[PDB]
Write a protein that binds this ligand. Structure first.
Ligand SMILES: [K+]
Ligand SMILES: [K+]
Ligand SMILES: [K+]
Ligand SMILES: [K+]
Ligand SMILES: [K+]
Ligand SMILES: [K+]
Ligand SMILES: [K+]
Ligand SMILES: [K+]
Ligand SMILES: [K+]
Ligand SMILES: [K+]
Lengths: 17, 17, 17, 17
DNA sequence: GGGTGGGTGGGTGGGT
DNA sequence: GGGTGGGTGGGTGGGT
DNA sequence: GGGTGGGTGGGTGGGT
DNA sequence: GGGTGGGTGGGTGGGT
């Protein structure tokens, strides 16, 4: 996943797809 | 709480302690 | 529930939906 | 963990120790 | 669970 | 959380 | 695995 | 990683 993501946004990157 | 208790009995068992 | 709510307003937020 | 455990009891076997 | 049970009982207890 | 809040709201929601 | 489980639990645990 | 996140998400993902 993209390095900039933090927190919830890391998990949501995979969820959103 | 003991199983045989019902209704207000269940709450009051906790109340009484 | 929204953070600003207090007291009865918290409960009624759920109640009113 | 012991094979018999299921569900919540698997996670909690690690939590207890 | 409901709002006529109350809100200084609390909000990860549930309403989802 | 308390027991003048009620017990067909429930007990896996929690309880000096 | 899912996104109402949460993000100070972590991203080398995975997102078949 | 924690157990107040849930257990029909899984246990070869990891576990002071
Ligand atoms: K995640
Ligand atoms: K996760
Ligand atoms: K009660
Ligand atoms: K009660
Ligand atoms: K309420
Ligand atoms: K209540
Ligand atoms: K677990
Ligand atoms: K887990
Ligand atoms: K209550
Ligand atoms: K997890």
């Amino acid at each position: 996943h993209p390095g900039h993501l933090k927190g919830r946004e890391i998990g949501m990157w995979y969820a959103k797809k």
